């Protein structure tokens, strides 16, 4: 219920001694959590927002020319002087055209000249910063209620909407007739706000690395410039013609939006105009499912037909959902649901919607369940008018590991050693294995920030090759293994 | 309690525009998308457009796409549509439907239970 | 715009009948998704949404609406007609052009 067909959907089962388990929530995707005994839930990250930012730099993108003004001295005399150099408003520049007696001096060589013209701004984009301590993620959770209408995500309505706080480690939602679910996130380990800017430029914004955005080669106002006119390196965005050595102007370059967008081709889209809420980055949390009970468990089972209102479709996931509308009496009661085998000998599949009820008799309800590979049986409802409801999957359990495999290894290469914490129950081997990742990626960090990802395998192949022509076993596998990862990583980026 | 309040009944000369407002109370406003749908007296309903209260984005009908304009205010809590050179076959009631975007703020998919609160109806003389 | 949604002008049952309602549309609204909601249209009254997602209805409708979809038709069901039930019946559609469409109006007379 509102994490079915987004493609982008993981499977966290169990929670360790104590009832909590480790994920990590991402804009775009949701996770779905099941444990014995307790309700499945849907999660997702909906929402980042960034309050109150303070603008770190203004920078000129489209500027114009006004008062152009120009001074000569005779050859030898010097350099000539412009009274319009005093302020800084004008962009000036000093430089030498021929003179003799042709011009009006008396002896003939080159001459100074000095061309002055008033420099404003028409165009600006506003750099701002905002402090890890004022962001507010939303996260909305949805219990796997089987509600009529709880598939369709986008609406979360009966989902409860939790905002998360750098101010409080705890957040607390009372999903009504579950119980609570506690909430311990961590906004302060997520985008690392205090490395970043919230670029704004003609009612679109980016987040941009703050380095690179200050070494922007744009005439640029202080983060606190009330004038508006002190425009630091103008010469970015003026050219001073003198072609033949004989006059000299100034022209301006013209609008940099272009250019802009071309240099912000790596960075993420974000919105700025109606608050800085911006959908991108991660959020690990700490799921506490102690206060977690199923819904309905004391209901009775359902004694009556069940008619299939939504024919049943195979999810993105490798997951089965059905709508049932209920014909029975007892209206409060529950769904007998179970995935068996064509002799019903046994039980093969494993329901998602645990613990499925009909709570008014009239409305339908949404099942999802997990059918085995190959052929299986969704068997619903006592024998007279038991529905049974064939199923093939068309899949493998090697396919099934292969995708697992793949899956995580793209969620490495996105979140890097955060990824050990998704799902993570806190055992030995996940913090040795994060630890080292934590190693690994601060060394390939360093050796591999800045560049393409066609640079990236370009290196790779390289380190491969050098790796496999390596007289050292032991050196040509680390050379190997560094090759090929650096190679997937290339591969698997710009996105 | 959702309410969706509409302006009084106008009679007016086919050369003028009228505009009719919605004011939207017991739900947030810019969470809905404000829809409008004219049903001239003894005919079939007609779905003009809608406008994105939570981001003023408005889509409208092939047939009224140059001569409906669509404002909501989001202080106000209401959806303006005006219609601009009447005709007597432009006699028609106007009810505002409702609609909720999605969580991004966008209106790209409506809800499957879309129009599920109507206005009173807004009768336009012509 | 696109083209409106054909269902028949009137339909007319005795009481307590099973009568029931088409809904006309090409692949790209009623055919091609399953947008397709019912509103009853009391005469100076704003129309009610019945059913939605062809088959739901909202909380406090009767379940003697029903709907279902076959390929490019859509039907609305009455068990039970009674005296309420004599309003004009009409059906929309969300067109996958991204807009709606409304049927012509079906006026059910109980009799």
């Known amino acids: 219920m509102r994490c079915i067909g987004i493609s982008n959907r993981d499977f966290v089962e169990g929670v360790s001694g104590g009832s909590w388990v480790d994920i990590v929530l991402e804009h775009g995707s949701c996770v779905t959590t099941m444990a014995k005994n307790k309700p499945t839930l849907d999660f997702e990250l909906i929402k980042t927002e960034a309050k109150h930012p303070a603008t770190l730099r203004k920078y000129c993108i489209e500027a114009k020319l006004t008062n152009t003004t120009t001074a000569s001295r005779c050859p030898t005399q010097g350099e000539p002087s412009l009274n319009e150099e005093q302020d800084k408003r004008f962009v000036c520049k000093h430089s030498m055209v021929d003179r003799g007696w042709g011009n009006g001096c008396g002896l003939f060589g080159k001459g100074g000249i000095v061309t002055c013209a008033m420099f404003t701004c028409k165009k600006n984009m506003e750099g701002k910063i905002v402090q890890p301590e004022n962001l507010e993620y939303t996260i909305v959770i949805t219990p796997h209620s089987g509600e009529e209408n709880a598939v369709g995500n986008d609406t979360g309505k009966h989902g409860k909407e939790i905002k998360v706080t750098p101010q409080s480690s705890i957040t607390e939602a009372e999903l009504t007739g579950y119980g609570t679910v506690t909430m311990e996130c961590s906004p302060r380990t997520g985008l690392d706000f205090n490395e970043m800017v919230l670029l704004q430029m003609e009612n679109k914004a980016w987040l941009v690395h703050r380095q690179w955005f200050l070494d922007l080669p744009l005439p640029w106002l202080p983060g606190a410039d009330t004038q508006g006119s002190n425009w630091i390196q103008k010469e970015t965005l003026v050219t001073f013609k003198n072609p033949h050595a004989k006059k000299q102007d100034v022209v301006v370059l013209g609008s940099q939006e272009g250019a802009m967008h071309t240099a912000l081709t790596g960075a993420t889209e974000i919105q700025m105009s109606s608050g800085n809420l911006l959908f991108t980055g991660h959020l690990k949390c700490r799921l506490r499912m102690d206060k977690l009970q199923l819904k309905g468990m004391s209901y009775s089972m359902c004694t009556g037909k069940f008619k299939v209102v939504k024919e049943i479709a195979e999810t993105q996931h490798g997951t089965i959902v059905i709508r049932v509308q209920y014909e029975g009496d007892g209206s409060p009661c529950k769904i007998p649901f179970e995935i068996m085998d064509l002799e019903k000998r046994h039980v093969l599949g494993r329901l998602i919607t645990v613990n499925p009820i009909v709570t008014e008799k009239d409305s339908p309800v949404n099942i999802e369940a997990e059918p085995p590979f190959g052929d299986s049986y969704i068997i619903i409802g006592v024998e007279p008018g038991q529905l049974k409801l064939s199923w093939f999957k068309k899949g493998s359990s090697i396919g099934q590991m292969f995708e697992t495999t793949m899956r995580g290894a793209k969620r490495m290469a996105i979140l890097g050693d955060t990824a050990w914490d998704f799902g993570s129950l806190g055992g030995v081997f996940t913090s040795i294995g994060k630890a080292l990742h934590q190693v690994f990626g601060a060394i390939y960090g360093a050796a591999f920030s800045g560049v393409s990802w066609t640079m990236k395998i370009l290196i790779g192949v390289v380190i491969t090759w050098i790796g496999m022509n390596s007289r050292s076993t032991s050196l040509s596998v680390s050379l190997v293994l560094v090759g090929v990862v650096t190679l997937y990583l290339g591969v698997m980026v710009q996105a | 309690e959702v309410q969706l309040v509409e302006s009084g009944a106008e009679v007016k000369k086919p050369g003028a525009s009228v505009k009719v407002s919605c004011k939207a109370s017991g739900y947030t406003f810019t969470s809905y998308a404000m829809h409008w749908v004219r049903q001239a007296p003894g005919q079939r309903l007609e779905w003009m457009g809608w406008?994105?209260?939570?981001?003023?984005?408005?889509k409208y009908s092939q047939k009224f796409q140059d001569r409906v304009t669509i404002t909501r205010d989001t202080s106000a809590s209401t959806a303006y549509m005006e219609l601009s050179s009447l005709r007597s076959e432009d006699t028609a009631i106007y009810y505002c439907?409702?609609?909720?975007?999605?969580?991004?703020?966008?209106?790209?998919?409506?809800?499957?239970?879309?129009?599920?609160?109507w206005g009173q109806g807004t009768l336009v003389t012509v | 715009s696109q083209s409106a949604l054909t269902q028949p002008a009137s339909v007319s049952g005795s009481p307590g009948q099973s009568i029931t309602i088409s809904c006309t549309g090409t692949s790209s609204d009623v055919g091609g998704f399953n947008y397709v909601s019912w509103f009853q249209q009391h005469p100076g009254k704003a129309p009610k949404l019945m059913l939605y997602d062809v088959t739901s209805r909202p909380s406090g409708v009767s379940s003697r609406f029903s709907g279902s979809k076959s390929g490019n038709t859509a039907s609305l069901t009455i068990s039970g007609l009674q005296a309420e039930d004599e309003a004009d019946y009409y059906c929309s559609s969300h067109t996958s052009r991204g807009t709606w469409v409304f049927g012509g109006g079906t006026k059910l007379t109980v009799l």
């Open positions: 406008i994105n209260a939570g981001n003023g984005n408005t």
């Open positions: 439907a409702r609609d909720k975007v999605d969580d991004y703020g966008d209106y790209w998919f409506p809800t499957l239970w879309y129009f599920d609160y």
